């Protein structure tokens, strides 16, 4: 009885991956597929609020609203194309995916046509029975919060809003965060030593426990965190995905061929 899952993160508006992904489909028969954010490039926005906060002035939401067509679009294309797809999926905003409730207008918008698809932030979704499927996107930080120009979240709230858990049917638990943890693989790349995750993750994963934690943004490999696997597939963009076994706990990390 496998549960095979096919995550990808960092999909950037790649459309023309998308017909690669479909055949890895085809061929691997994952039950379900994750998609770990950035959907976004949505560069306008992120460096306007990063240029005002380093001016000390007050952001311009003038350029949320000459951007909102552009994002309004994307997204719905997204939304289409992932769920033309036709896999069970789970989507989980990155930092670029915002406004949170533009994203999530979208995503109200794609469940009449596409009922195979759920959004998870701040939130959580069970999964033939068995397990319970969190999702929390964003740049998870220490002291930063932001939803308009980019997803950035504090750890105050992250650990305020995830005392939800605890309330949950018992079951095996699995993460997806767009934020990794600390890791010797999956917070990094070979091109620096430095870690790009945060601690806030490996806190969470310390207070949740999960089983398996699915995560975004820099990195790509899978170790242990705690007692839980953490994967990073790698970049959507060099044709990186990962292929979980839930059942047997197989995780390979690969790339189109």
């Known amino acids: 009885m496998p549960r095979k899952v096919l995550a990808i993160k960092n999909f950037k508006e790649r459309f023309d991956l998308l017909p690669k992904l479909k055949g890895v489909i085809a061929e691997k028969q994952p039950d379900i597929l994750v998609v770990v954010g950035n959907i976004l490039k949505n560069e306008a926005l992120e460096k306007e609020y990063e240029r005002a906060h380093l001016a000390r002035r007050e952001p311009n939401r003038k350029v949320i609203h000459e951007n909102e067509h552009y994002i309004i679009e994307t997204l719905d294309k997204f939304f289409r194309e992932i769920g033309e797809l036709g896999v069970k999926t789970f989507v989980v905003p990155g930092k670029n995916d915002a406004p949170l409730k533009i994203f999530l207008r979208a995503a109200y918008e794609a469940e009449t046509a596409y009922p195979n698809i759920r959004v998870l932030h701040e939130g959580f979704a069970g999964w033939r029975g068995e397990f319970e499927v969190i999702g929390f996107g964003g740049l998870l930080t220490e002291h930063e919060f932001e939803e308009d120009f980019v997803l950035k979240y504090p750890r105050w709230y992250v650990e305020y809003i995830l005392k939800f858990v605890n309330e949950l049917k018992p ?14 693989f999956v917070d990094r790349t070979p091109e620096d030593p430095k870690h790009h995750g945060s601690a806030v993750v490996n806190t969470i994963i310390k207070s949740l426990n999960p089983e398996v934690a699915i995560v975004g943004h820099v990195g790509k490999g899978h170790e242990l965190v705690g007692n839980t696997i953490v994967v990073n597939p790698g970049e959507f963009e060099e044709g990186r995905y990962a292929f979980l076994d839930l059942t047997q706990h197989k995780i390979k990390l690969e790339q189109f061929s």
């Open 171 to 184: 079951r095996r638990l699995v993460t997806i965060f767009y934020t990794p943890p600390i890791g010797e």
